[PDB]
Amino acid sequence: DRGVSTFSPEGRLFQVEYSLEAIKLGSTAIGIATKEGVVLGVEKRATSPLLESDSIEKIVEIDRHIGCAMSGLTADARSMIEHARTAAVTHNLYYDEDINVESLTQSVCDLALRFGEGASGEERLMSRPFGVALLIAGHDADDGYQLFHAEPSGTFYRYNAKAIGSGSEGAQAELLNEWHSSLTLKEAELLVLKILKQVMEEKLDENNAQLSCITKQDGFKIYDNEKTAELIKELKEKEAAE
Amino acid sequence: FRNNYDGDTVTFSPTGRLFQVEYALEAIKQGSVTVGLRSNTHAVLVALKRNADELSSYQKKIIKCDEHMGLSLAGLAPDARVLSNYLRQQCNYSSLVFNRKLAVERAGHLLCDKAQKNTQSYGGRPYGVGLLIIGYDKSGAHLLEFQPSGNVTELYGTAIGARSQGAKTYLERTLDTFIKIDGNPDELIKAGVEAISQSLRDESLTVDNLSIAIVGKDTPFTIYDGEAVAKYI
Amino acid sequence: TIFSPEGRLYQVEYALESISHAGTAIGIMASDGIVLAAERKVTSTLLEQDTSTEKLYKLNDKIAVAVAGLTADAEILINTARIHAQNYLKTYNEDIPVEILVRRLSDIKQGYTQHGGLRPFGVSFIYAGYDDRYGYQLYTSNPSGNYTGWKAISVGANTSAAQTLLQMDYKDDMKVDDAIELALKTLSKTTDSSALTYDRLEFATIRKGANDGEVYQKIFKPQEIKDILVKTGIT
Amino acid sequence: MTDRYSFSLTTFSPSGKLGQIDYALTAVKQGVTSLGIKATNGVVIATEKKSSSPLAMSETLSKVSLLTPDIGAVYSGMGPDYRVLVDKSRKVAHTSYKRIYGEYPPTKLLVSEVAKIMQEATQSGGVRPFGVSLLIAGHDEFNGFSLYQVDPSGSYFPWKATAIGKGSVAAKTFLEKRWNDELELEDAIHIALLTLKESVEGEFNGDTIELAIIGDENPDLLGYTGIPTDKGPRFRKLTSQEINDRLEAL
Amino acid sequence: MDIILGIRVQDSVILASSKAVTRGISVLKDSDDKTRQLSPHTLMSFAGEAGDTVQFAEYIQANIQLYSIREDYELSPQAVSSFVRQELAKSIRSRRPYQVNVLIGGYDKKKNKPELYQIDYLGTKVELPYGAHGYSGFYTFSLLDHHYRPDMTTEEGLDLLKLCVQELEKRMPMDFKGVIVKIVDKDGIRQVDDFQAQ
Amino acid sequence: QFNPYGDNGGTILGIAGEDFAVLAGDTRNITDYSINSRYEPKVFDCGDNIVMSANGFAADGDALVKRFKNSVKWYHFDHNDKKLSINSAARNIQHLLYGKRF
Amino acid sequence: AGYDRHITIFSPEGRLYQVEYAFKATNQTNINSLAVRGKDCTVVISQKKVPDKLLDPTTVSYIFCISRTIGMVVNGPIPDARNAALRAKAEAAEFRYKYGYDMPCDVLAKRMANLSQIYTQRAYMRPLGVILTFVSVDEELGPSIYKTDPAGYYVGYKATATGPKQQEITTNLENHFKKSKIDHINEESWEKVVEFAITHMIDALGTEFSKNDLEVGVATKDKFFTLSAENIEERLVAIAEQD
Amino acid sequence: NSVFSPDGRNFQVEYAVKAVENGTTSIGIKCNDGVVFAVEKLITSKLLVPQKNVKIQVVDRHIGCVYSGLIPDGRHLVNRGREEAASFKKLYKTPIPIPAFADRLGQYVQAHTLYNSVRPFGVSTIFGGVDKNGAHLYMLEPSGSYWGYKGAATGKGRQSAKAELEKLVDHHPEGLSAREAVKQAAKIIYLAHEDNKEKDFELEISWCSLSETNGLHKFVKGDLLQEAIDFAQKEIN
Amino acid sequence: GYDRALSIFSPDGHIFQVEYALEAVKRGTCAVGVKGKNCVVLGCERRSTLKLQDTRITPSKVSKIDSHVVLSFSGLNADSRILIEKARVEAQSHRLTLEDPVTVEYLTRYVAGVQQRYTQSGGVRPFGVSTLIAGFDPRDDEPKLYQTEPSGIYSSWSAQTIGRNSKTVREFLEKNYDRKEPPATVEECVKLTVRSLLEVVQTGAKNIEITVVKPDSDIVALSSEEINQYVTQIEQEKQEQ
């Protein structure tokens, strides 16, 4: 123990590496990109049955064309979501158009850098890295449907599919087998739900899991519980015959 | 002796070493490989990108700075964004105020000075990224190597990152051939692509694997990815 | 200003420890007034007692404090409390309600608990005051920034012994005079000195003032302490 | 450049001590002995001019200092710390009082202010406490004569007579035996000169003793005539000649 | 020129405030309420410069409500009016002063007395049996000097104001579109929502 | 007193067709009753197939053109080389101008 | 690594190790200086050692002209010496501008003493490893010698010495004043005071000096100047034909 | 850094010195009307562009600076040196005297030995030029210590270089010429490369002479550089 | 300028200062909240170190934020005053700019936001406080209950408890509170609140205090006796073989 932005002898930033450990303790979040949209799904993980399950907001809208799922210390995501919404709305104000998904992600990632004990910048207004990863999914005319993983390192990666949180190692393997460049939106929905069922340390129902997507034509929508339950009936029945 | 002396950048060890800087340099040795080389008419960057998964994008390693300048990175990528951003402004200031394209050498000196401050200020950290800078200015083509220690050197060719030595060795021997590839862009790229291959246990560089950048006499700095690099594999 | 594994505040706990070695101060709240009593820390013959004030301070005309802790740390907090009371009066043309002044001082202490990297004030206060909302009021504040109201209370050295005795003899319908007596008796039993003399004491009352309908603050003179010590049979 | 130590260097230990204040008091212990005695018509403060080599000019060092025309100060502990507190005290007597009320502050309030400066050095970031104890003697129209001690913590208290530094224990005893509430000034000086002999090792004359009084008004030290409403400073430093005269009949 | 009238009777305070809002050559509103409730027993009326007026009132309102909730207690009318005064007295020497005149009408429950305070934009405060701001005072002060009695009932107070309004509708150059009248007593604040066509 | 504004005279004209647009201007530059230049262009290609002219006080005009060209450049840097559409340019120019409202 | 050894906080015995270590630093250059007062001048002498043959010897000096009237000699390493010299020059020029008369020797001593006191009290500043001897013929006070150290201490002197062999030179000087019964060198010319100073430097150190082994500063009424090697040679010649 | 050790030395400065001694070797030689500077440039690899990684730096128009240790630290110092020269010129009109320039760097380097939040410079700088009254040569250590020199050397081969300079001083009391000092510098750099010869090297020289450059700082290129390289090669075969 | 980072990550990805703040919460006196069909009830306990207190003046553990929202807390009392003030200022500020009083959710998000901010700022320690915030949205009948904690996480609860021995009382509520059939009466809702507090407190004397919130700013604290009525009716009745 010595400082915040210190390097290890292996050339990694201690605090950035430890924030990653915090994310591994988080609830699972999975995203799947297709040519008909991007689906985002999360594990609620209520700590008690008295917790009102739909007060758990781990999937948030950023703009009509951009959505977000989070994993780790979810309280740290509030000021990231806020910064992303302002960046998207401001862009529309300055440019009379939608921000690109990649540009929005880069801005959130720029925010992520701003940690350090009054460090030599301009100016670091943050004492530690965020303890939260984000999956940012959306659509823009140029590059179509897109999924991004934004770490508190300030790095972001594009993905066809990605899982973050406690069940991510197992989830990612299943995503490698199941993903192909011709998945429909409905197939993607079933696949997220399926993999979530595998890694949830409860039995997946409409109250402990939440689905969402973004399509060009209808924007980012969160699925309400009734629509989710129908897919959970549909998954179990699809996975009986086979 | 190696104990309390790696706490911050503001502390020398009894040997005269700055360990935090040595550790920053180490983030490079872990970064994906990238190659720089130039003739007298063009300068080329070749960068093997690294993916996280088979489902992920090979994260981009070449950043444009002006119409005549650009760079490739190895190590902490966000640090390459801070530095290239600064270079973009410096090139921009040179244009607006003086109607003058910024010399690659000045760009080198500016990056050095910027990196230096962070090796001396308390509470800050050294940059954790190496950069290869190419440009074409009023004195021809140039390649620069930037180290986070703040050391910049001008070279005919070089390579940084994991197993860069193979490519650096190959370039030391190919010297007299490649420096003569004038007015022939595709052969300079070719020389760079075969230079990077001497550094691959990995695999065979694929279409989404490869990134190429060129600048030269009547050629603004431009980046090639995927479809446009297929002819070089 | 950091947490321990247990969830306590190191520097606060240690400041309270510091206070527990300071001269005892007692507050007793009656039906018709309040008593403040304080013992001076192991003194001497040459120490001037005439022009001496170290434990009892006037905050405004309706409010006084008893101090247990670092005398100098306390002067700092007394001065800003005096300013705060005046800001309130200037703003509202009404004397500050005791609780409001107390909350403000406790918020200041709390700050040093939560931010800034400075050490907390090594001070505890007993506040005696009157206002027309709650009448007579007795409050306590310590370095944690915590404050509570009391019928009777003690701070500094030997609070366990003192508290036990006050709970034994205090009753809701007491008069100021019985309260004065109770305070002095309690200090007689808890002292580290042979006996309790006048030159080792500070004493104040806040009375409804014989006949007027107005509140009066009395900081007892050396002779007045000496006299009130006789009547009660401690001579 | 710039300050990194933005945190308190004096913190509470588990037993409740403030270590740096204790160590400051220890520093004061090694200090040369100084004393003050309060009479009915005056105050006397006195100390020893410990000289380091006879080549040093003892008179150039101010161990006893005028703070205001009616207030003086002396110390034990670290000389350089004293010297800067004298400067800040003089200034604050003006900035916090004379520029507001057009008159010099009363002793207890000036003492209050010095105390404040010393307390801040106990809590501010990046500083150590002052390693001195002060004796401040003075007079003001409404309180008369007074003598105070100020310690590293910023604590102050009024005394009838006291001593600080090396031989303080023994000297406090000596004064207790000799002090009554009826002493004339000349008596207090004589008692002060007796108490100070116990302290010193070597020479004991007017050139190794610094002594000042707070007494009557000295009109011939005012520097001007024509305004009957003030007759000068009550603070006076005794000369080398004046100490010697009282030593022959000692 | 906005009519702001106040009259303190024996057991209540009555505020009468003009309903018109006029910019240039147009009456934009004929039903404006130039009044904010500060606490259950304290009402403030205001006139002056177009934007400053409501921003000041609402800023005062927010502050008093905050005090109430923090102390679970109502400030006296005297205390409220001192707060308001100090605010205006600060404002007058700042970069851009609030150009706002106020009447504060409250019932002090601890004293069981009604109170009327008049304060102008300079921070000039005074307690009065009756008050007014602007031109309307040039008619009403002399009127009330004659017809006012210290021990009137609330019903007599309302007849007194009727006389004041009538005099203003006869001699004032501008159409102020009648008044809204509100009473502050022991019970609180109510509106006599039937004064204009009575 | 120092007057920070001048008038360099000069007239510009824009016409939109079905699948083209023209932006024209004279090349004359004047101060009071003098000619500074007979050929000082004031219509500029700004990249991304946008042309621009800012006519009146030529110094202010030049600054705005510079700042917009630079805007286009940074747009390319920040938004993965996206083409700046004419409506987006317009809006961006509003902000440039309005930042100097006073 | 106990913090009371690294920053200027008190140790349990009430000590400041950093200050003590700063005193130790003052002797690093292994140089002795002495100052004496004449009737109407003040003289400073300091050994001059130029080991390296590569050095330009005219640049190797530990004596400084602070103002027209004040000179200063430093015992301690040159970087810290120069820092103190630059600050004193500024202070003396500032004083003259604000107050309309030349900064007296003792007031600048006091001011520098105070600055040093601050490094003694504040944690982020190390003390300077130097002793500063200030000299002049003061318009009110006459010949003057005032000396400050890393503790923030300062006092005036009849004469003084500083360096590794300080004690020997001091006692030597004490013994002269004991006998002569005065507090100055009773000589009309500054040349003879320099001669006195060098003579007693020789006796106390048991060393002969050539012209490049010393450095001399002289303060007169309205001037402080330093001697050339050739001026010093003439002084050395005169002591040869006597002692 | 704001830390004395018990021996009165500054341990952080002491460690900075080690970094200097670990650096490339560089020299300055004073001559009768000027100063010459030379440095050793390690050829890490054949890929280094010859003559294209300039180490010597100009300050104003009349001052040269060369250094050994952490090259970036040396650059930081020259930048400050330039702002200090500019600010002297702005106010006093005349270009900055070399003793004045020396104290400016002196004070600045010394400031980085005062605070625990800053580290000392990891360079020894040799610099100088010609001013209103002659040529001056200085060397500045990490402590901020500096003096005037007849000849100066720093870096890995400092010892052998110093001995050679000593031999010149003793054998040319009448003074050396700019033209001669140039060749002598080439010799000395070849004769310090003995202690750093695990790698090939490129020679760089600059000079400032009243008769040879009109008192301006200038690099030694072409014929004159080759003549010096020739002469240095000659006296070693 | 003291900005030395105090809340930092551990190798296993934990922020120990936030973690230890949670310990101070568990050290604090118990607090409980349960919401009914047309009400929400808050309940606290009082400690027994000393009992010569004056209760007329001593700060109650349930604070009004605005006329329709209340806040109760476990942990450092002194810390909670700071959150309460900021919450009160926000409530007034929201009234001023939005012309509507705060929703209970919004006020919760604000307080939770403040606690979060104190987990990532140089030279500040997190709040040793966890809160229950209850009330009704303006012009709405649906009851509301939210919990915040030192990390800045917040969520809504059918019922919830915090502080010392809350492990035990959450045990009770999990068995007893039926999602199907909330306690339909104010009376039977106060019943479940007293029962759950009885497991920990001992004698509901000068220790158990209760406050009821109803729609449209209807907030009443109970009295010692009106408490004793529930104490008596449950201890004797629910003691049968």
mmCIF file of N, CA and C in Angstrom, chain H residues 129-190:
data_model
loop_
_atom_site.group_PDB
_atom_site.id
_atom_site.type_symbol
_atom_site.label_atom_id
_atom_site.label_comp_id
_atom_site.label_asym_id
_atom_site.label_seq_id
_atom_site.Cartn_x
_atom_site.Cartn_y
_atom_site.Cartn_z
ATOM 1 N N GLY H 129 29.365 30.276 -22.964
ATOM 2 C CA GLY H 129 29.338 31.129 -24.131
ATOM 3 C C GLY H 129 30.234 32.333 -23.965
ATOM 4 N N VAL H 130 30.052 33.290 -24.871
ATOM 5 C CA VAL H 130 30.828 34.516 -24.915
ATOM 6 C C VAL H 130 29.892 35.676 -24.606
ATOM 7 N N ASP H 131 30.291 36.534 -23.675
ATOM 8 C CA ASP H 131 29.498 37.714 -23.359
ATOM 9 C C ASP H 131 30.324 39.002 -23.410
ATOM 10 N N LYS H 132 29.722 40.099 -22.960
ATOM 11 C CA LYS H 132 30.331 41.432 -22.997
ATOM 12 C C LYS H 132 31.798 41.447 -22.549
ATOM 13 N N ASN H 133 32.185 40.506 -21.691
ATOM 14 C CA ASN H 133 33.577 40.454 -21.253
ATOM 15 C C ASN H 133 34.217 39.061 -21.201
ATOM 16 N N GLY H 134 34.120 38.332 -22.308
ATOM 17 C CA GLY H 134 34.887 37.119 -22.474
ATOM 18 C C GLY H 134 34.097 35.831 -22.518
ATOM 19 N N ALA H 135 34.830 34.733 -22.672
ATOM 20 C CA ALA H 135 34.262 33.400 -22.710
ATOM 21 C C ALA H 135 34.119 32.864 -21.290
ATOM 22 N N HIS H 136 33.091 32.048 -21.053
ATOM 23 C CA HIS H 136 32.861 31.440 -19.741
ATOM 24 C C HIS H 136 32.424 30.010 -19.914
ATOM 25 N N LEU H 137 32.887 29.145 -19.020
ATOM 26 C CA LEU H 137 32.483 27.746 -19.017
ATOM 27 C C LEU H 137 32.032 27.357 -17.614
ATOM 28 N N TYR H 138 30.916 26.642 -17.526
ATOM 29 C CA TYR H 138 30.336 26.249 -16.244
ATOM 30 C C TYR H 138 29.917 24.795 -16.269
ATOM 31 N N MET H 139 29.949 24.161 -15.100
ATOM 32 C CA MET H 139 29.312 22.862 -14.916
ATOM 33 C C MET H 139 28.433 22.922 -13.684
ATOM 34 N N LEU H 140 27.233 22.355 -13.805
ATOM 35 C CA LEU H 140 26.208 22.403 -12.771
ATOM 36 C C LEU H 140 25.781 20.992 -12.365
ATOM 37 N N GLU H 141 25.973 20.666 -11.089
ATOM 38 C CA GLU H 141 25.634 19.333 -10.556
ATOM 39 C C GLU H 141 24.162 19.283 -10.076
ATOM 40 N N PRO H 142 23.594 18.073 -9.895
ATOM 41 C CA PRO H 142 22.229 17.924 -9.375
ATOM 42 C C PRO H 142 21.890 18.711 -8.105
ATOM 43 N N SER H 143 22.886 19.038 -7.287
ATOM 44 C CA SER H 143 22.650 19.824 -6.073
ATOM 45 C C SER H 143 22.361 21.300 -6.368
ATOM 46 N N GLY H 144 22.693 21.737 -7.579
ATOM 47 C CA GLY H 144 22.613 23.143 -7.928
ATOM 48 C C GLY H 144 23.972 23.801 -7.828
ATOM 49 N N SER H 145 24.948 23.059 -7.323
ATOM 50 C CA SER H 145 26.331 23.510 -7.255
ATOM 51 C C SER H 145 26.889 23.760 -8.655
ATOM 52 N N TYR H 146 27.573 24.889 -8.828
ATOM 53 C CA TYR H 146 28.250 25.199 -10.084
ATOM 54 C C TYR H 146 29.494 26.038 -9.849
ATOM 55 N N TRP H 147 30.469 25.885 -10.743
ATOM 56 C CA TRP H 147 31.615 26.781 -10.785
ATOM 57 C C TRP H 147 32.030 27.080 -12.229
ATOM 58 N N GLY H 148 32.883 28.088 -12.406
ATOM 59 C CA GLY H 148 33.582 28.308 -13.673
ATOM 60 C C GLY H 148 34.690 27.274 -13.860
ATOM 61 N N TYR H 149 34.946 26.894 -15.108
ATOM 62 C CA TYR H 149 35.954 25.888 -15.413
ATOM 63 C C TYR H 149 36.827 26.308 -16.582
ATOM 64 N N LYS H 150 38.043 25.763 -16.618
ATOM 65 C CA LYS H 150 38.913 25.806 -17.792
ATOM 66 C C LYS H 150 38.538 24.645 -18.705
ATOM 67 N N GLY H 151 38.174 23.535 -18.080
ATOM 68 C CA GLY H 151 37.740 22.342 -18.780
ATOM 69 C C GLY H 151 36.855 21.571 -17.835
ATOM 70 N N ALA H 152 35.889 20.848 -18.392
ATOM 71 C CA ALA H 152 34.873 20.189 -17.589
ATOM 72 C C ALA H 152 34.421 18.923 -18.273
ATOM 73 N N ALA H 153 34.021 17.943 -17.470
ATOM 74 C CA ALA H 153 33.598 16.654 -17.984
ATOM 75 C C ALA H 153 32.666 15.990 -16.997
ATOM 76 N N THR H 154 31.750 15.201 -17.539
ATOM 77 C CA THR H 154 30.760 14.505 -16.752
ATOM 78 C C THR H 154 30.333 13.262 -17.539
ATOM 79 N N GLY H 155 29.711 12.303 -16.860
ATOM 80 C CA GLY H 155 29.325 11.045 -17.495
ATOM 81 C C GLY H 155 30.234 9.868 -17.177
ATOM 82 N N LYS H 156 29.949 8.740 -17.827
ATOM 83 C CA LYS H 156 30.622 7.462 -17.567
ATOM 84 C C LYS H 156 32.155 7.519 -17.682
ATOM 85 N N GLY H 157 32.658 8.318 -18.621
ATOM 86 C CA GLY H 157 34.091 8.444 -18.827
ATOM 87 C C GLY H 157 34.660 9.746 -18.307
ATOM 88 N N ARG H 158 34.050 10.271 -17.249
ATOM 89 C CA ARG H 158 34.436 11.568 -16.704
ATOM 90 C C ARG H 158 35.897 11.576 -16.222
ATOM 91 N N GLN H 159 36.304 10.509 -15.524
ATOM 92 C CA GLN H 159 37.655 10.407 -14.940
ATOM 93 C C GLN H 159 38.761 10.513 -15.998
ATOM 94 N N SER H 160 38.710 9.652 -17.011
ATOM 95 C CA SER H 160 39.717 9.704 -18.072
ATOM 96 C C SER H 160 39.692 11.037 -18.840
ATOM 97 N N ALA H 161 38.501 11.610 -19.010
ATOM 98 C CA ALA H 161 38.349 12.890 -19.693
ATOM 99 C C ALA H 161 38.972 14.027 -18.896
ATOM 100 N N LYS H 162 38.732 14.030 -17.585
ATOM 101 C CA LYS H 162 39.297 15.036 -16.685
ATOM 102 C C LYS H 162 40.824 15.061 -16.690
ATOM 103 N N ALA H 163 41.430 13.873 -16.630
ATOM 104 C CA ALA H 163 42.888 13.726 -16.686
ATOM 105 C C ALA H 163 43.463 14.310 -17.980
ATOM 106 N N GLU H 164 42.769 14.081 -19.095
ATOM 107 C CA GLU H 164 43.163 14.648 -20.387
ATOM 108 C C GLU H 164 43.061 16.172 -20.426
ATOM 109 N N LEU H 165 41.943 16.704 -19.926
ATOM 110 C CA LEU H 165 41.767 18.144 -19.774
ATOM 111 C C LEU H 165 42.871 18.743 -18.900
ATOM 112 N N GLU H 166 43.194 18.062 -17.794
ATOM 113 C CA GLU H 166 44.259 18.488 -16.867
ATOM 114 C C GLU H 166 45.599 18.632 -17.586
ATOM 115 N N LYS H 167 45.892 17.668 -18.454
ATOM 116 C CA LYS H 167 47.105 17.672 -19.268
ATOM 117 C C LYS H 167 47.165 18.849 -20.240
ATOM 118 N N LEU H 168 46.015 19.240 -20.791
ATOM 119 C CA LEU H 168 45.933 20.410 -21.672
ATOM 120 C C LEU H 168 46.161 21.720 -20.926
ATOM 121 N N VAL H 169 45.520 21.845 -19.768
ATOM 122 C CA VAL H 169 45.631 23.041 -18.949
ATOM 123 C C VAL H 169 47.096 23.292 -18.595
ATOM 124 N N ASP H 170 47.780 22.232 -18.172
ATOM 125 C CA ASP H 170 49.185 22.304 -17.764
ATOM 126 C C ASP H 170 50.150 22.581 -18.906
ATOM 127 N N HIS H 171 49.796 22.132 -20.106
ATOM 128 C CA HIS H 171 50.689 22.252 -21.258
ATOM 129 C C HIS H 171 50.356 23.422 -22.179
ATOM 130 N N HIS H 172 49.285 24.145 -21.870
ATOM 131 C CA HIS H 172 48.902 25.316 -22.648
ATOM 132 C C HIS H 172 48.465 26.457 -21.730
ATOM 133 N N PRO H 173 49.377 26.926 -20.846
ATOM 134 C CA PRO H 173 49.024 28.034 -19.956
ATOM 135 C C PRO H 173 48.733 29.322 -20.735
ATOM 136 N N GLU H 174 49.342 29.447 -21.915
ATOM 137 C CA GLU H 174 49.141 30.599 -22.801
ATOM 138 C C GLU H 174 47.726 30.650 -23.394
ATOM 139 N N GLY H 175 47.001 29.536 -23.298
ATOM 140 C CA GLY H 175 45.648 29.436 -23.834
ATOM 141 C C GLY H 175 45.599 28.627 -25.115
ATOM 142 N N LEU H 176 44.466 27.976 -25.339
ATOM 143 C CA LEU H 176 44.239 27.182 -26.535
ATOM 144 C C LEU H 176 43.442 28.010 -27.544
ATOM 145 N N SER H 177 43.454 27.603 -28.810
ATOM 146 C CA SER H 177 42.644 28.280 -29.828
ATOM 147 C C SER H 177 41.349 27.503 -30.077
ATOM 148 N N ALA H 178 40.304 28.214 -30.490
ATOM 149 C CA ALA H 178 39.029 27.593 -30.816
ATOM 150 C C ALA H 178 39.217 26.425 -31.781
ATOM 151 N N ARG H 179 39.896 26.697 -32.893
ATOM 152 C CA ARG H 179 40.242 25.701 -33.905
ATOM 153 C C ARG H 179 40.906 24.458 -33.288
ATOM 154 N N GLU H 180 41.852 24.680 -32.373
ATOM 155 C CA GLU H 180 42.563 23.588 -31.690
ATOM 156 C C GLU H 180 41.711 22.846 -30.662
ATOM 157 N N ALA H 181 40.911 23.600 -29.906
ATOM 158 C CA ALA H 181 40.028 23.046 -28.879
ATOM 159 C C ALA H 181 39.001 22.091 -29.464
ATOM 160 N N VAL H 182 38.523 22.407 -30.665
ATOM 161 C CA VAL H 182 37.630 21.540 -31.438
ATOM 162 C C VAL H 182 38.228 20.156 -31.678
ATOM 163 N N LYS H 183 39.474 20.121 -32.145
ATOM 164 C CA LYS H 183 40.165 18.856 -32.406
ATOM 165 C C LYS H 183 40.419 18.140 -31.094
ATOM 166 N N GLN H 184 40.842 18.905 -30.091
ATOM 167 C CA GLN H 184 41.149 18.367 -28.772
ATOM 168 C C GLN H 184 39.920 17.724 -28.114
ATOM 169 N N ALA H 185 38.758 18.346 -28.322
ATOM 170 C CA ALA H 185 37.473 17.816 -27.867
ATOM 171 C C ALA H 185 37.151 16.484 -28.526
ATOM 172 N N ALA H 186 37.410 16.397 -29.830
ATOM 173 C CA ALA H 186 37.202 15.156 -30.563
ATOM 174 C C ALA H 186 38.121 14.088 -29.998
ATOM 175 N N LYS H 187 39.364 14.473 -29.710
ATOM 176 C CA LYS H 187 40.322 13.540 -29.133
ATOM 177 C C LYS H 187 39.819 13.033 -27.782
ATOM 178 N N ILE H 188 39.432 13.974 -26.919
ATOM 179 C CA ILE H 188 39.015 13.653 -25.559
ATOM 180 C C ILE H 188 37.781 12.753 -25.524
ATOM 181 N N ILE H 189 36.827 13.000 -26.414
ATOM 182 C CA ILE H 189 35.631 12.156 -26.487
ATOM 183 C C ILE H 189 35.977 10.726 -26.911
ATOM 184 N N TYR H 190 36.887 10.592 -27.875
ATOM 185 C CA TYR H 190 37.396 9.274 -28.271
ATOM 186 C C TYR H 190 38.171 8.589 -27.139
#
